[PDB]
Structures are given as C-alpha cells and as structure tokens.
C-alpha cells in the first residue's frame, strides 16, 4: 500500500481495454495469452490478445466494417441482448469508445481467420478523425486483437506518465492475471507468473493460524479472508471488473460472515458485539462471476445486481467460519465482549420511581455489614417504600474533581441512576426522582461521620 496521486479517468480508459481482452476469454475459451506493453517514454499503451479476433466484415445494418462500428461509434456492443445470460464485463458498449475519445491516437489491429485478412484502422484527435482501414491478406497466422492508444494527457492534466499512474496500471495487470482463468499475462515481454486467484491473493501476504484464508466455494465464487489492521477492506472482482467500491456482491458475502460469527460469539457467551465491530476487523477478497451484472455507472465500481439475480449462490460454509474464529479476529471480539437491573446489590423499593417516588426512601449503607442490617430491616418496614444500596467505601469528593473522574466513578453513577438524579437546573421538588428520601446508615464511628460529610458534600 502506497500513497499515490493519479487521474482516475486515465486509469479507467486503460481498464476499459483490459476488461475487453478478458471478456474475449469468455467468448473464446481457447485463448491463452494477453500482452500489456507500456511505453512510458512515448506515452503509448498496447493491449494484445490471442484467440478469436474481430470479424472483418461489413455490418448488414450499419453499412460499415464491424471493427469501425464497435470501436468508432458510441453505443455499440455484443452485450445488448440479455436473453443470453453472459458473464462478460462488457455491459453498455462504451469502454472501447471511451478510451478512443480520451486518446490523441487510437489504433485497432485484428486478424480474422474466417476471411483470412488483417485489419488495421487508426483514429486521431479524440475519435474525431477516422482513417479508412488498411486491409491486407492474412494467411497461415494466429488470430489476435491488438489495441494501441496514446492517452490525451493534456486533458488528464499530465505532461507524462509518472511513477504513480504507472505503478497502478501495472497492478491492474496483475489483477487480470489473477481474476481470469487459464490465461498467461505479460507485462512488457515479462511473464506475470501467477496462475489462479489464490496465487493472486497471496501477493498481499507480506502486507497483511495463517495470515490469509482462501477457499473456492464453487465454479463462480472464490473467497479469501484476512484480519484487517485499521478497518474493513475489500478487493473484489465481478467478471474481471475491479469493483473497488463494492456493492451487492461484497455485502452478500460479508453479511453472512458477520451474521454467523455474531451468533457464535453471542451463543457461547452473553453481550455479543455490534455488527460493524465484526465487519471492520475483516479483509475480504472476492472473485465472482455474475450474470448480466448492473452497476452504478459505466466505470462499474459498484455492483447493484440483487442477490437473487446473481445466476448463482455462494453459501459460506461453517468450516470456513470456524477458521476465521481461529485468527486474531476472534480474540478481538472476545476483548469487546420500572426496576433497575444495572445494580444487583440494590434492593429497589417496590414503588420506587413510581407515582410514589417521593414517598419511598433509599437507604445507603456503609459496608455490607450495614447493608445486611438494612435488608434485614426491610423485613420490618416493608419493601414498598424502602430500598437500600451499599456505598463501597470512602466516597469521592465531587468538588475539585474532573467531570471525567466523576463520570468514571461507578459508585456515584449508580447512586444517580437509582435515585433518578440529574444536575440540570435547580431542584425545586423531589417529584422528579425515583426516591423522595435518602437515609444514611454509617457504623456510628468517626469514619462514618466522614462518610456522612462526603455524602452531604
């Protein structure tokens, strides 16, 4: 984790091209390789992917080449029919064009083995200039799609691609390697090594019973858990889309782990903690595949697709929860883990605080000896109008005492709650109190006199 300063827009248009290459693995499972070449010096970025490419063919309705149609015109996508439940990232048909629009230069190059042709077309000046595509014969070669763009840095308020934006883009490439299944990603001709989402989650090991708890719940859900240091943290992926703000999916997972834990902590011992205290001691990693997802914006940072529309469910097992309970998170929650129930010793007068609050009398006693005597006296003077509470010891001199020291003294507070006492205004009548009379029972020794003095004070 490093403090950085980046232009989100720039980072996003780069994400739009990555997510497009990752979508192609869903399209053609035979894909194996994705290249990401950042030439910082030339402010140029290249994203190449093998497998099936872009059909080089004239669209029967738009009367232009398909590449020119889906990369040069807004609102163009293959994800417009929702009858077919797809797990692609593409949903709205903006992201290619949104990269083009932000770019001083944008070039599409694709090889179609069906027509045996190579297709290259260049846009310039924020997709306002559209050069005719150069089409050549392409025989005995692999099909591929290569997107190369030069960001309009002047619009992003940057003179060059500084270390901060670079460091982030690179980490977004490691994301793809981890979130996508059965592919090999290369950063400037260098293999990224990681092979599955577990390999990915373990990259955070050194920053973070083990330290990382991973599992695969099913064909569409992968969950990892670690104990957070300061507050709740999440790194999730919906169809290889970095959902950095979370959403319905994240909550769907966390709402379980928090629910089940709370029952376990509560069941074993009383006083179980508030939900937020459990959640904010978690680090949650999520890699899932949602059918035709929906987001808050085109950036797709926050999923909103209701759980019942996920196209699959993820039931967090009990075994998983019992392992989380083996980490520091548990020992953490254990650390946090009219009548009056607040004070056991208190023999509350039957009528106390009631319409006869003024009649009843509370008897404060010096020590449990005096207390025992008083409670014995109840058996003679009746409970209805008489209670008793034992003063611990020498009472706290309230004057020349900090408000905090007074607030902290459980003994004065107990008194204030039993008598129904507040400082506000000037006391005119007892009427507002639980008790209307206060009786002092001290051993009749000098120290007793002192106690009386402290009470009066």
């Amino acid at each position: 984790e490093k403090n950085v300063t980046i232009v989100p827009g720039l980072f996003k248009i780069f994400d739009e091209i990555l997510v497009n290459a990752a979508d192609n693995k869903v399209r053609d499972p035979s894909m194996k390789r994705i290249d990401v070449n950042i030439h910082a010096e030339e402010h140029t970025i290249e994203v190449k992917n093998d497998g099936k490419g872009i059909p080089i063919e004239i669209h029967n309705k738009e009367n232009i080449y398909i590449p020119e149609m889906i990369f040069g015109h807004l609102l163009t996508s293959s994800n417009y029919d929702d009858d077919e439940k797809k797990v692609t990232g593409g949903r709205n048909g903006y992201g290619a064009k949104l990269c083009n629009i932000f770019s001083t230069e944008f070039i599409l190059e694709t090889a179609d083995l069906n027509v045996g042709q190579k297709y290259v077309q260049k846009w310039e000046n924020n997709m306002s200039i559209c050069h005719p595509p150069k089409i050549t014969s392409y025989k005995k070669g692999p099909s591929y799609t290569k997107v190369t763009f030069k960001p309009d840095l002047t619009r992003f308020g940057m003179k060059e691609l500084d270390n901060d934006i670079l460091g982030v883009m690179r980490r977004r490439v490691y994301d793809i390697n981890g979130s996508v299944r059965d592919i090999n990603v290369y950063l400037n001709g260098k293999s990224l090594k990681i092979r599955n989402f577990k390999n990915y989650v373990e990259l955070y090991l050194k920053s973070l019973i083990p330290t990382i708890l991973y599992e695969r719940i099913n064909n569409r859900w992968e969950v990892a858990f670690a104990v957070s240091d300061i507050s709740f943290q999440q790194i999730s992926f919906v169809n290889s889309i970095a959902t950095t703000m979370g959403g319905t999916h994240v909550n769907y997972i966390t709402d379980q782990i928090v629910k089940k834990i709370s029952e376990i902590l509560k069941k074993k011992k009383k006083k179980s903690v508030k939900s937020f205290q459990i959640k904010n001691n978690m680090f949650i990693f999520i890699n899932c595949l949602i059918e035709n997802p929906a987001f808050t914006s085109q950036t797709k940072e926050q999923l909103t697709t209701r759980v019942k529309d996920f196209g699959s469910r993820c039931e967090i097992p009990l075994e998983y929860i019992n392992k989380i309970m083996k980490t520091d998170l548990a020992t953490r929650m254990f650390e946090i883990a009219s009548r009056i129930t607040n004070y056991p010793k208190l023999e509350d007068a039957n009528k106390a605080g009631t319409k006869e609050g003024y009649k009843c009398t509370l008897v404060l006693t010096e020590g449990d000896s005096a207390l025992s005597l008083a409670v014995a006296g109840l058996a003679v003077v009746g409970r209805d109008y008489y209670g008793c509470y034992p003063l611990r010891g020498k009472m706290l001199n309230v004057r020349e005492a900090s408000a905090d020291q007074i607030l902290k003294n459980a003994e004065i507070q107990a008194i204030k709650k039993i008598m129904g006492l507040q400082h506000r205004k000037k006391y005119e009548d007892t009427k507002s109190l639980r008790y209307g009379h206060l009786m002092i029972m001290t051993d009749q020794d000098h120290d007793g006199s002192h106690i009386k003095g402290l009470i009066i004070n």
Partner: protein, 49 residues
C-alpha cells in the same frame, strides 16, 4: 492462610435456616443470611463469636 480458617469459623457459626442444625459457635453479627447461602456475610474484623 488465616483467611481459609476464618471462613471455616464463619461456616461453623452460621445460623440461617439451611446451614447448621446445631451451630457450635454463635453468630454474633452479620454471619450471612439465607438470601445468598451465607455469602453475604461480613468481614472477619466485623463479626464476633
């Protein structure tokens, strides 16, 4: 420890229903009540026997 012994004595003295059919020592003070099974009792410096 003298504490345990003091408690032994208090136990020998307790006179609340359900304690000693015949208390060999007299509970001259708050030697506990039936309210908590003698646990209420007061400290040794208090009660006599």
């Amino acid at each position: 420890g003298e504490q345990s012994l003091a408690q032994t004595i208090i136990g020998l003295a307790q006179n609340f229903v359900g304690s000693n059919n015949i208390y060999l020592l007299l509970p001259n003070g708050a030697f506990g009540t039936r309210a908590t099974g003698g646990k209420d009792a007061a400290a040794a410096r208090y009660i006599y026997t």
